[PDB]
Design a protein around this ligand. Structure first.
Ligand SMILES: [Mg+2]
Ligand SMILES: [Mg+2]
Lengths: 52, 100, 141, 313
RNA sequence: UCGGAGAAAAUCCUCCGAAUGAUUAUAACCUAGACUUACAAGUCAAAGUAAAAAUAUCUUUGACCCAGAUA
RNA sequence: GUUAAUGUAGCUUAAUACAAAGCAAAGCACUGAAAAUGCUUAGAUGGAAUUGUCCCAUAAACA
């Protein structure tokens, strides 16, 4: 099974995007483009949306 | 669906027009013709479409083609069908703007 | 004023006017074949059993600048036809001919194993120090 | 199975490249887009060089070098004319000047533009020289023992495409001395217009059997009329093709420069023209009353002015 | 209902599969010109700009209304 | 003596030009072997015409 989760930007902005990960693995963290800051920054998982 | 040749040889083609659709590589990109991720073929310039046969040489890195190519007999080499568009206009000209 | 009569449209016929300006087309296809043909001028280095050669050819296929050990003057001053120094020398001979010819920008397409070859690296060193650029500038649309 | 199989990529590549050049019945990409004393002497030197241990040592120590100047002189004498011809045809000089006729260069002509007093810029085939560097006449030297030396602006004409301008023409040159030539045309600096690309300037040398009166060709001195600098090489050499055969070549490319403004103003005495490179307008299909499934931008592609209008109000 | 193979563009004709999963160095915005199509939905993409030092490959679901979640 | 001759380097009916060319073959390194790959090796027009026959060196059989 897999779960849809919400990755939140740690730049101080509220920008977020949804990604997929299997429920077995650990919480995700990633680098992604933040439009409001116009730079690549870290996105850290904060909440779970749904199970798919 | 309706996979086939959208533009036949000898037709005026504008930039962006799609020339062919294919599940597998029945035709290959040639001169001024690009590849779509779905493997469709579109024209990169305004001109006339042409179909021509030509020799095929693969990238060195890919294994499967190199293995086959070397294994071919000495006598001859394999061929393929290629698509090309022949540009029909000059990209620009010089004109008199001011006399100073 | 008779001298001030000028036609509305100028017509330069230099076969290299647009190419130098950077506003000339380079073929952009050949995505299933090697090598890419998106070059104004390309350098081909050929190694034979007994001789080593190098050519500069335009897209149409005409050779413009050529240096080869087959040339008499080169060999008489050359100890060996197939040497690392010979590769450096033939490159240096080619470099001077290019500069006078005016071909300041060029592209090279070394295959992986050939690229690893020490001699080719030496040849590239000869070209770059002479100031011939091995990558062309991007077209202006 | 009888035929052997290529053991390496390079063997296939070279064979394929040769295969492409050969003509084929099927359609192909190319169709649409297109003495003994010397030898005995030569062998002796090679054996001597091979015998020399020092040359072998230097080669394997990768310290050897070659004299460039000596090779250049040797190349000019041996097979330089063949290479020299290629450049002229590639740049279109033969087709534009002689209507396709070809003459092999033979005399290693030499020219250089004096810069200040210490240095002088050479003029090889295809070199780049600024108009400022060419303000004054150059030094010309060649091994001879009459001659005519000629200058052209192949693509610099401002009214007629075919015609070209002279800078200066010397006639009845005896042997090597050049001060004895008749100055039919006084010297002028290059004047390529702004934004008009690269112009090619050619140096021509013709062997003269017997001296010929060029009275018709002579231009007044000083002459600042462009109507008088215009000419054609093709017909000009036709009237003299009995006693004139070309034997030299040298050309260079020059762009616009600040001095060009001075030339157009001070002595040409006319306002300088400016040219710009214009691309053709973008193509758009015919406009429709109902553009089904097209974005709002569709209306913008066909409008001319960006500012609102109010009609009768 | 959707996709793949034969008949070969018909069938209640002969068969297999799908309502995902794995790895991802994380795949932006903007915009000529086209395919496909009754409508609705679905594909591909030059140039320009921006992050970096360009595309993630394997290869298949569900309108509107109406209720959610947080910032 | 007549044939038959064999006559650019293992091969080529490469070449006679602006080079005596291309290919085969060889050494070392690279570890299964081979191949590939990198760095290295050695060379010939008997000699002509005329080419797409002598010619003598040579030459078995004819003799
Ligand atoms: Mg629709
Ligand atoms: Mg783009």
């Amino acid at each position: 099974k897999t779960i849809l989760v919400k990755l939140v930007s740690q730049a101080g902005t509220g920008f977020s995007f949804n990604h997929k990960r299997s429920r077995l693995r650990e919480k995700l963290s990633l680098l992604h483009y933040d439009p409001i800051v116009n730079k690549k920054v870290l996105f850290v998982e904060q909440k779970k949306i749904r199970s798919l | 669906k309706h996979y086939g040749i959208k533009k036949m040889e000898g037709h005026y083609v504008h930039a962006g027009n799609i020339l062919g659709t294919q599940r597998q590589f029945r035709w290959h990109p040639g001169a001024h013709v690009g590849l779509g991720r779905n493997k469709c073929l579109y024209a990169l310039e305004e001109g006339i479409v042409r179909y021509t046969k030509d020799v095929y040489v693969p990238n060195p890195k890919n294994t499967e083609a190199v293995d086959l190519v070397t294994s071919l007999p000495k006598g001859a080499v394999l061929y393929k069908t290629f698509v090309h568009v022949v540009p029909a206009k000059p990209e620009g000209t010089f004109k008199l703007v001011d006399m100073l | 004023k008779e001298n001030e009569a000028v036609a509305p449209e100028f017509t330069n016929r230099n076969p290299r006017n647009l190419e130098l300006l950077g506003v000339a087309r380079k073929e952009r296809g050949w995505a299933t074949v090697w090598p890419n043909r998106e070059f104004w001028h390309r350098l081909r280095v050929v190694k034979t059993q007994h001789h080593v050669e190098a050519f500069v050819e335009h897209l149409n296929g005409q050779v413009v600048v050529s240096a080869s050990t087959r040339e008499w003057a080169i060999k008489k001053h050359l100890y060996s036809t197939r040497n690392v120094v010979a590769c450096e020398s033939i490159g240096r001979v080619l470099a001077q001919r290019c500069l006078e010819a005016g071909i300041n920008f060029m592209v090279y397409q070394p295959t992986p194993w050939e690229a690893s070859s020490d001699s080719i690296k030496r040849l590239q060193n000869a070209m770059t120090e002479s100031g011939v650029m091995l990558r062309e500038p991007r077209r202006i649309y | 199975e009888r035929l052997e199989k290529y053991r390496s990529f390079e063997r296939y590549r070279r064979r394929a490249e040769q295969e492409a050049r050969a003509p084929h019945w099927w359609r192909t990409y190319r169709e649409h887009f297109v003495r003994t004393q010397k030898l005995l002497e030569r062998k002796h030197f090679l054996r001597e060089l091979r015998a020399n241990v020092e040359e072998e040592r230097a080669a394997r120590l990768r310290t050897a070098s070659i004299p460039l100047e000596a090779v250049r002189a040797e190349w000019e004498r041996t097979c330089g004319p063949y290479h020299k011809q290629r450049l002229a045809e590639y740049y279109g000089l033969y087709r534009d000047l002689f209507h396709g006729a070809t003459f092999v260069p033979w005399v290693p002509l030499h020219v250089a533009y004096a810069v200040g007093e210490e240095d002088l810029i050479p003029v090889y085939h295809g070199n780049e020289v600024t108009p400022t560097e060419a303000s004054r006449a150059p030094e010309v030297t060649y091994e001879a023992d009459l001659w005519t030396l000629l200058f052209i602006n192949l693509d610099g004409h401002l009214l007629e495409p075919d015609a070209e301008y002279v800078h200066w023409l010397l006639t009845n040159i005896p042997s090597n001395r050049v001060a004895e030539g008749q100055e039919t045309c006084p010297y002028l600096p290059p004047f390529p217009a702004r934004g008009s690309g690269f112009h090619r300037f050619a140096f021509l040398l013709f062997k003269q059997d017997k001296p010929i009166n060029f009275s018709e060709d002579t231009r007044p001195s000083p002459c600042y009329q462009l109507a008088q600098r215009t000419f054609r090489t093709f017909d000009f050499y036709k009237r003299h093709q009995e006693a004139m055969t070309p034997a030299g070549l040298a050309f260079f490319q020059c762009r616009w420069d600040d001095s060009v403004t001075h030339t157009f103003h001070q002595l040409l005495d006319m306002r300088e023209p400016v040219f710009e490179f214009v691309r053709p307008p973008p193509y758009h299909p015919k406009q429709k009353r109902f553009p089904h499934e097209q974005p709002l931008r569709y209306l913008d592609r066909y409008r001319d002015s960006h500012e609102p209008t109010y009609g009768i109000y």
